[PDB]
Amino acid sequence: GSMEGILDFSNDLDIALLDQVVSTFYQGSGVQQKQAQEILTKFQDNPDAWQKADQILQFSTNPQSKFIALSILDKLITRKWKLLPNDHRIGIRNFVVGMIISMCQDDEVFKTQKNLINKSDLTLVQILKQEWPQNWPEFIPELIGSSSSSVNVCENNMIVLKLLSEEVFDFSAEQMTQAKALHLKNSMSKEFEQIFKLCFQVLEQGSSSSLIVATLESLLRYLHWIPYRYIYETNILELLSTKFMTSPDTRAITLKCLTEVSNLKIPQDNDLIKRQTVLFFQNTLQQIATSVMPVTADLKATYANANGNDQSFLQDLAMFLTTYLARNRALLESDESLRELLLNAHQYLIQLSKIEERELFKTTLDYWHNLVADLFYEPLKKHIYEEICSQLRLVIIENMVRPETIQLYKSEREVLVYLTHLNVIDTEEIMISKLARQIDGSEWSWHNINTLSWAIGSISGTMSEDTEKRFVVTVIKDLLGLCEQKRGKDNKAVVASDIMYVVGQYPRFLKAHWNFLRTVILKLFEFMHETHEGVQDMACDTFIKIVQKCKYHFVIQQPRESEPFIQTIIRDIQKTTADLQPQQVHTFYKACGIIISEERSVAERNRLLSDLMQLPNMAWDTIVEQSTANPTLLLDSETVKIIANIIKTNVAVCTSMGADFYPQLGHIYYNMLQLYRAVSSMISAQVAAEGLIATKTPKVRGLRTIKKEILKLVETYISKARNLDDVVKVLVEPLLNAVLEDYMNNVPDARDAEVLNCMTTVVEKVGHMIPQGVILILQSVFECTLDMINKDFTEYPEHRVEFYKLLKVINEKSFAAFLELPPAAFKLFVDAICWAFKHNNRDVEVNGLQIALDLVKNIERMGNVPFANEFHKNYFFIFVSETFFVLTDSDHKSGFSKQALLLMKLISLVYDNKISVPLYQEAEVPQGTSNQVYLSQYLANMLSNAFPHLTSEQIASFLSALTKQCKDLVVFKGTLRDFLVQIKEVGGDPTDYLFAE
Amino acid sequence: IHFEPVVTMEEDEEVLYKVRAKLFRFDADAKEWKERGTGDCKFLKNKKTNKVRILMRRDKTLKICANHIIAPEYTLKPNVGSDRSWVYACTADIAEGEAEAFTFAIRFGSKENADKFKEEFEKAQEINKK
Amino acid sequence: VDQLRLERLQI
């Protein structure tokens, strides 16, 4: 349309056309807006658009247009400044300075266009980063001078200085070379005395709130880096902690300044400093008490009301109090005259800890952890805080979150455990009283009984066994009566669940009271027939949890019993689990396997195992007899689900028994692999008859579940096996014969990535014992899986991940399998590794970089032999250049550290002459040229063509440094990051690469 | 002595069936199914007309993702990839504004929830036949 | 402990 006229640079820029495009983008909508956006982007991305910025800034009446003009200038200053003719550099500086002065002088502009002025200030700062001080030594003196002649200019100079400090000290690490960052830090540090003088004069004398606030905002930045003497040898702490805490305009920024002050580097042997540190805290707390709110105030309610900036203020007060007290509270702990201050500060924190705000609670909770840990270890401190700790007990107990929010529960548990050790009597009393108000109904609610139950469970192990015993009794007695008293399964379910939760948290109590433990389990078994939502899950979860902690008491014969209780559980398992869902049945069997593995008499353990598996083994025999006599059954979804659940039961028990599971595995192994084959050909037949869409059908998904569960069973056992001779001689060969060809000869959409995962475990555990088997694995999965994943980075995501895990372990444990590869296949292996480099997916990328590193090491270990020499001739520079590519292309930042490690190993091979042949071709350099010289030459040429805007000097200095530093990973990395900065601009200083030296 | 003391459009309907479900719409131009919402699917019987509709709202935001009469001409069909879903053409759904036609798929937590939805769906068609 | 009558717990 018409709007595209600004894109035609052969004409003069119609400024009114620019403003129309900008208005349509910012204030317009829909299709119009979108067109304008695409035009504006094309405009500012024109490499000549900066030439028209001085027009826009002079003659536009639209502040958005000028903002975009400054963005265009920013790109130029940041990337191409040093390529400009020097006259344009001076011209751009002068234009930007003048524009800022003029905007400051017009009070209407100064108040109405803060966004445009802030952008101009930032553009100025970009110029300073290029020009100052070496080409602009007077900037700071003239800034200080101009500040005195105008409040607006002075205020704006505080913004400029704030941004300069941010750009030099807070955001330089990843955007400048090490040398340039140091140069600017030293330059600011050299002239900060004069800057501070202006800043302190403004704070002492000024009356313009807006100027004061800007000065304090810049002070906040300075506190990140300035020497402590500017804070402690001036009166600035007094001003911060009194004058500026009184007006709310300055209060927010001042508090943030004082928080950073609480983090300055200060000598800890100076008594004057210590009193100053006490004093500014005392002043601040006094101002809060008299100007904001007293310590008794309900901060929970204030925060909830969310008036004005109250929420940010209370957040900032929490940060101030916790930061200062974590560092300095010892200063307040010995002087009786500071005791009130110490406790008032902590009382504010108590009140802050009642606010309903998860992230703020975590901030205060981290501090409480710091406090109560110190009271637990440090002599003569806990009595000071007795009343604070008592209140904290109630706060934590009442805000306990669900354990089974994982991180927050663990932090709360930790604090409460400390608080229990500090005063066990007070903790018990609070919890009992709390339980009474659940019974009297005054604080009764589903939520409230739950949180109290979690709190009670969380302190298990802190009381003596005698005190624990009558505490647990009291709690359960009260909880039982509470459940009696309520009506409806809703309430009774909630309370019975909490009872089982508490019980499960006190295994020490269960192990000492067998009859009670028996009653619990039998009650859980009862609850496994209760269909009210949640009860059965709760029952099974509590069962396995109690078992994990008390298994020994199920496997011995307890006095007054006829048999170990595990026998009684097994005898009645059919009725016990009759009403459970399969997933819950498997948990039950897993719990039984935990117990059975505690039996170390082998004949008894194996009898228990075969008895436990009686029902699945009989179902199994039946289906094996049937399904073998009629493969059609396997299309009956009912038979498929039965089969899968049998195998899942075996997985569950094998999970808890590991090596002990072997006898049960032997009962089913050979027929299970025959079932694998029968299901496999059923899947293939369906895909033949119906197409690829068959893999989505329930029938085939069910069949593949069987295959996956069989593989998971074998993986689970082999990962835990202790007799590896049996693994190799009995399990592996039937396994490979059953799974490898089926995988290779299925179409891609029918191959189970789980095959790769299972093979990864085989190689891990016994790879060293089956070299021919590893070769067979590679032959059957390597090329066909690679072809699935080497066309994009997205298809077959699970095969992708498992593929590189398998290659990684093969490269670790049976590298000889890659040696036997025919040369065309070894080349595919190298391509596969580099392909992995180029993934953004961390799973693949990390393994790809590690395989590369491990491979180099494997080759190095071979010594000076033909395969190793051919490897370097064929692939050394491929690995060097592919590593450099992902290091420098800005799309693989997540792998920087491992790319650098790989690159460093590669370069060090050459500079230790661990490569025994020339890396160059016959007549490419004189006879006798060292690989060192050739490597430098190859890299110089590579970087020159890849980054043509670098000077030869830049490249040569970078490579000289990188080469010298190839034993020092930290420094090597610094030099790589310096190179990544320099390739983003023109004219980088080649002496930057001498920084480490 | 008297002391003065201190100072959705579903309400006219009956809930016949309620079930949790995920609802898809078919983008024929992209040849793919797209999720439209997860939440409670309700069959609502107007007290005045006895006409039953499907009304489904997303969790949390409560935004309408299905609102249309259970027309007697509709037909629930299985999807090739699911034993717990139904597919059917809808001629006039007003969840997002002007009455639009859609090919919907609705999936449930279990095959038996799906079969029951089908039962209730067809009972509701009978009611709308009158 | 045996005084606790947990076997009576009901839902």
Add this chain to the structure above:
Amino acid sequence: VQFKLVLVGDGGTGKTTFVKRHLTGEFEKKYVATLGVEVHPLVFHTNRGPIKFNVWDTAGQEKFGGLRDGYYIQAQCAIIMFDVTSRVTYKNVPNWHRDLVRVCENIPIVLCGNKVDIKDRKVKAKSIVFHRKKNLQYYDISAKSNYNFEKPFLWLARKLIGDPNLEFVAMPALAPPEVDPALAAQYEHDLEVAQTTALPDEDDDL
């Protein structure tokens, strides 16, 4: 009653997928990088009436950044997004925040850690502290599982309207119309295709 919201963060963190979920209910599995910005109106119904967010969904990849901080002008709220499976995206949160608040000096901002549905989380909850000193609201979210997916907008609505008790409510549900044999063969074609295209994510609980 509309508010400009800018959504920023590293490429691939889920900004566009998050907005799409809110706009249509769909979950887009494909990564199509945003070019510059896409603007989408988004309305929520509340007990204080409807609130309209004009969402400026910006590009996170540098080479597609477009006007970059030019998009932030006059924003009234923002969401900063990162991916809890990618540490670098958290390391860059301070850089996005810096560029944002230099233009928007005093606006409510939500920080969102996306993709918590992925088991192998890399940015541990304990590591996430940047919001504390910057007064940002933080939420774990997942556009895929919808975990906390409404919280950023609810919290922003509360700040923008100044009502801490504002709630989302059920948009009214108008009676739908009762309703052609000339398109009986054409709807049957679209139905055959729809029936033989498998529903996605058939293992999800829904």
